[PDB]
Design a protein around this ligand. Structure first.
Ligand code: HEM
Ligand code: HEM
Lengths: 715, 702
């Protein structure tokens, strides 16, 4: 069967066809805020004291549709807050709280996101007051941060500026067709590269050990691997788990078969709420969220060093949750009736979750926690730093943090860049520098490839990398395989440093130029020289302001995830990619926040400009040496050429003319633009007889967009 | 192994396969357009040189290509088949299909079994498209190639009108639910199976399928017979070899083929060995010249079932009957006469037979009917005649175009509009009446074929005035009479030659009601108004052709008829897509029309405000209230009642009303206009959307 349009569509006949709809995600037509809504200018003016008062009033006020445990919705807001930021993953930077996707993405219905719909609904009275001055993404994490502040914990700081989105970001979470699927492992615990979760729908880890096996060692291994795949080491992981579970409790009062469907498969009358329980009242003393009934600490609404005292004070035999789940309880009934009830009444025995004994059984976590057992100040500092890192991972450079709560110091995981310490070049020194660069003896190909390598490391997901920082001469990026440290990127870098030294030593006044600015300027000078060679007199815009980071300010391991395993624009293909070359090219274009016409012009320009990996002729459908001409598209649509795969199986094709002599050679990413019906439509726009000026100006616009992707200090 | 990557089609539809897909509302965004935002195609094609354009197409047709050799040397019949396959997907019941957007070059259509060998046809035209570029769209070129092919082989066509704008992503259209390529349900074919119903070679049974499928695209018996007789006067059918040697369709073909599909491994694979459908029929002895030889052959011999070399039912002349009188595309022996299984329908069928026998002696009538039918075919979804461009548009108008009179007087502006608004408000008509009438006039528009709308003043004419959604035997006649009284009162006391038309008064009364409601709510605004509409008469309105425009479900008026295929939620998004509205525009329109009182039969279903006839955002603030517990009505009416904190029913709503508070994507938009200090934004957005809807069919001012 097939569904008309609003149920399904074209992906049914050909399930594995190239999907170009990912390149126009979040269109401005679907934005209800108009094309003049500058979120930064709005959120820069809110009153944080009033917002804190409103959030505290919401936390301390119980609501009939979701009775508050202990008369406080703080712990629920903390859980919501990190579950928003717990979907981040360093593989590609997707996920996290930077987009507020917890509302309508394919989560909002994940088994671990149970009872978080009520948490987001409880904050409507706050969002109602501030409207557009405060986004949902900002409010979700600020609610948890303010809950931590109100429950006695002094946090590091906070930064506003997470722009809302009005369309689910299509993120690959796994190949498992059913919830809690475990088809993402090979041999031992070897979680597949794209994913960062043990199962499907689980944020971090099943709270029963691997696949329901209540073994603290294996659970510890899973915790370590899962947190490692989200930029967290052992100390930060232990701090996060200890601090987070200091507050609140779990909800496993009744059997889980009485819980209704998820919000996305719920009746209309529920108003977008899901998991409606039929046990008892269904809320409050009879709430069911995960099936485990554990209260870790005897003061679950205050911050103190009581989680570790309880953890190391008992023996933790194994028992069963009243909903039928695995959990640990203090042996010999020690400390019975010492844990208070959420809604008044009898006490509880001390219970620990199956993954909470990992912190005292695994040797690494055991040493860390035993250190924190008698040194609560270290735990407080570590938790503050880890929480700050967790909330602001995918928010980008420090220039994007708004509001008055931003901390003053810099952290290495932010990829800090130094502030501008001189006066920027403008409109005359730029011309002189471009003249010097074009007279420096570097070819168009070298400059263009160096500029693209510097700038095409940006990810639109977590806004890491980019041309700012001048990090292409630093160790992680100067040695990448795609960058070819052998044949180039050393002559170019040395020449650019010589030019920078010569200019700075003689520039008037206190005007200097940074290395990154000079790299981008050389790229632009090469572009305009090639355009002049083609026959067009144009000027590539340049925005100075970049600064040079140092080696000590660059984390080599943190940058290892930005290395491209496949760069279709440079016609480079590494090893171990999950998909063919064209799909990887679309993924790269989506990461660069490009559209389809922009991708087309960038590919067609970089092909003829000589910015190919190893300067290979794969895709150079031109006879002009380094001229920004309209030749890639003209020769791609020519049917005087018959394409057929190379006799030596390489993933490369050769195009023979009418005389049978091989004229062109190409790859998957070169022929996909002439084969795909949606892409050939764009290629035919620039392949027309009168499209060379339009192609040149479009290429310059796309190039300037790519160079300025990471310029958040001027935008 | 399920749950593929989002880059290869993964997404939320894999988890919940029957959820509201809001991506149909942001379809074909401006960011995917390579031409930019300042591109005006109407100002580009108007400067084209048709004389130089026909000169290129002719030398393209008369120049064989090594990769697709030409049959008899001319590529004309192939272009005729392509042009009609482009326009042959039109559907009257929703307007989707046709050559309006040139979707034949995109994924759904370019890989249909009937569109075989048409990927080669669209590529032979690349040299023409290369010369002109943005001055000539693919959609315009595809049909102009067929028109110029008809002209080149001796047929004088009616005319041609440019103006089809290219779109850059395939249009999602429901072609049927079969999940297998190739009646109770419609298969993957264009009109009918060439071998008869379900492969049964009976021509009498194929006649009824032809009649039904052509009637479902606004063609009667005379136009159906003329189209088939004229189209099959040219060209031949390609069935030279078995069909198992044909490769995959273009969407499943490898990259070597550069977007071409159906690569044949039989013989050379092209030309003398071409395999497209597998029937191998040459209808006429002069397949590259227009003449009255199709009907002469059809009525000149007796026919007989045989099989094509590929294996397929076809008719050949009895006992020889002039073998070798039909030339083959590439020099060789002649062939005996041969007719398709659906071409005998025009002979053995009581209705078609009389028409074809009449044309057998009067070919001039056949030529005239074919010209008219072809012109109607390639211009079904152009819309109003004001959208035709180029120096080839015929002067005289046609009934199927929904003609309206030209403006024959001075237009009101900015001084009579103010006075007209002042007496519409003081005429006794309530805000609900005016708003409902204005919405009823302008909601008939559908953006697929650009039919209907406020222009023409057809809300008072026979088809629309009697629609169930329009007047539940109520105010519509009273509003129409009052507006006409105002019209004849204003026209007599006019300053000079300034006069106003009835449709203009309908839209202006809607705008005046909006202004009155906004002033009641506390905002002083002005709804933009662009005069220029005219009034059509009853004879210029075809009652039967307007019957398909009747809304079976209007989510904005909270009306649900009978015979809808999907629940009320999905039909609302379908109509919003037909009105070319985005999700915020749909949201503001739904939230504003409820409090204005535009509900069908003035029902309280979804009126979440206490003081009606006032343009507030009370719908959104009362939808997001969590003090209201929604639960289905005791009677299975499909309505829900939301009780207060006590056991008192505070509000009542329907599926369309409650889906905005339930769908997570739609609730995001509701929380924008439902927030505090968000009422001025809501008023401005509602006014912008209302003005956009009022001016949907105004192609005479663009
Ligand atoms: C940054 C790390 C973490 C933080 C900040 C955190 C915080 C919290 C808080 C405050 C609660 C109480 C919710 C409430 O009382 O409504 C909670 C519940 C819970 N946590 Fe975490 N936790 C973290 C890590 C983990 C990990 C690694 C697991 C592994 C299984 C886990 C599993 C659970 C479960 C199953 C619940 C029960 C929720 C319910 O039943 O309603 N958490 N968490
Ligand atoms: C019930 C109606 C029709 C049926 C079943 C039908 C079927 C067919 C089939 C099966 C072919 C063979 C194509 C191939 O094998 O390459 C064909 C060819 C053709 N058709 Fe139709 N057709 C119909 C109506 C029309 C109409 C309305 C037109 C034009 C207005 C038309 C114009 C043509 C032309 C010109 C060709 C020749 C193609 C060529 O020479 O390459 N046909 N038709």
């Amino acid at each position: 069967m097939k569904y008309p349009v609003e149920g399904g569509g074209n992906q049914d006949w050909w399930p594995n066809r190239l999907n170009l709809k990912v390149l126009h995600q979040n269109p401005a037509v679907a934005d209800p805020m108009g094309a003049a809504f500058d979120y930064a200018a709005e959120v820069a003016t809110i009153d944080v004291d009033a917002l804190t008062r409103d959030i505290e009033e919401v936390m301390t006020t119980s609501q009939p549709w979701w009775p508050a445990d202990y008369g406080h919705y703080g712990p629920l807001f903390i859980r919501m807050a990190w579950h928003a930021a717990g979907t981040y993953r360093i593989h590609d930077g997707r996920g996290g709280a930077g987009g507020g996707m917890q509302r309508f993405a394919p989560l909002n219905s994940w088994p671990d996101n149970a009872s978080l719909d009520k948490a987001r609904r409880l904050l409507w009275p706050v969002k109602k007051k501030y409207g557009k001055k405060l986004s949902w993404a900002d409010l979700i994490v600020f609610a948890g941060n303010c809950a931590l502040e109100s429950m006695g914990f002094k946090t590091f700081g906070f930064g506003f500026g997470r722009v809302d989105q009005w369309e689910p970001d299509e993120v690959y979470w796994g190949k498992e067709a059913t919830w809690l699927g475990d088809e993402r492992y090979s041999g031992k615990r070897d979680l597949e590269n794209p994913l960062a979760a043990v199962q499907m729908g689980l944020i971090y880890v099943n709270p029963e050990g691997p696949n329901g096996n209540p073994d603290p060692m294996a659970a510890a291994v899973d915790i370590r691997e899962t947190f490692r795949r989200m930029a967290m080491n052992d100390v930060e992981t232990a701090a996060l788990i200890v601090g987070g579970h200091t507050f609140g409790k779990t909800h496993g009062a009744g059997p889980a078969d009485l819980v209704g469907p998820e919000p996305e498969a719920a009746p209309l009358e529920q108003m977008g709420l899901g998991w409606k329980s039929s046990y008892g009242t269904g809320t409050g003393k009879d709430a069911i969220t995960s099936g485990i009934e554990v209260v870790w600490t005897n003061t679950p609404t205050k911050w103190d060093n009581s989680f570790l005292e309880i953890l190391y004070g008992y023996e933790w035999e194994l028992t069963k949750s009243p909903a039928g789940a695995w959990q640990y309880t203090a042996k010999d009934g020690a400390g019975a009736g010492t844990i208070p009830d959420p809604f008044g009444g009898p006490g509880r025995s001390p219970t620990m979750l199956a993954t909470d004994l990992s912190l005292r059984v695994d040797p690494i976590y055991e040493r860390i926690t035993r250190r924190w057992l008698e040194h609560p100040e270290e735990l407080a500092d570590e938790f503050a730093k880890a929480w700050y890192k967790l909330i602001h991972r995918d928010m980008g450079p420090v220039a994007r943090y708004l509001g008055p709560l931003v901390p003053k110091q810099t952290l290495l995981w932010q990829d800090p860049v130094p502030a501008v310490s001189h006066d920027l070049v403008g409109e005359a020194e730029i011309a002189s520098l471009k003249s010097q660069i074009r007279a420096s003896g570097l070819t168009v190909s070298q400059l263009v490839s160096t500029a693209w390598a510097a700038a095409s490391s940006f990810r639109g997901s977590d806004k890491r990398g980019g041309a700012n920082g001048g990090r292409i001469r630093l160790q992680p990026q100067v040695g990448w395989e795609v960058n070819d440290p052998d044949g180039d990127l050393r002559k170019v870098i040395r020449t650019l440093e010589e030019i920078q030294e010569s200019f700075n030593s003689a520039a008037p006044g206190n005007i200097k130029v940074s290395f990154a600015d000079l790299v981008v300027l050389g790229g632009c000078a090469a572009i305009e020289k090639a355009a002049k060679a083609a026959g067009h007199n144009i000027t590539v815009p340049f925005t100075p302001g970049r600064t040079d980071a140092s080696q000590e300010q660059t984390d080599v391991e943190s940058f290892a995830v930005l290395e491209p395993k496949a760069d279709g624009f440079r016609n480079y293909l590494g090893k171990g990619n999950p998909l063919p070359a064209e799909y990887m090219l679309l993924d790269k274009a989506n990461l660069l926040t490009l559209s389809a016409p922009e991708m087309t012009v960038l590919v067609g320009g970089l092909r003829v400009l000589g910015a190919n990996y190893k300067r290979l002729p794969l895709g150079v459908f031109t006879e002009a040496s380094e001229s920004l001409t309209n030749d890639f598209f003209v020769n791609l649509l020519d049917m005087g050429i018959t394409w057929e795969p190379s006799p030596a199986d390489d993933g490369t094709y050769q195009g023979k003319d009418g005389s049978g002599k091989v004229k062109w050679t190409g790859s998957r990413v070169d022929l996909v633009f002439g084969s795909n019906s949606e892409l050939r439509a764009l290629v035919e726009v620039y392949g027309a007889d009168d499209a060379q000026p339009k192609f040149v100006q479009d290429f310059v616009a796309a190039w300037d967009k790519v160079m300025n992707l990471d310029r958040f200090d001027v935008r």
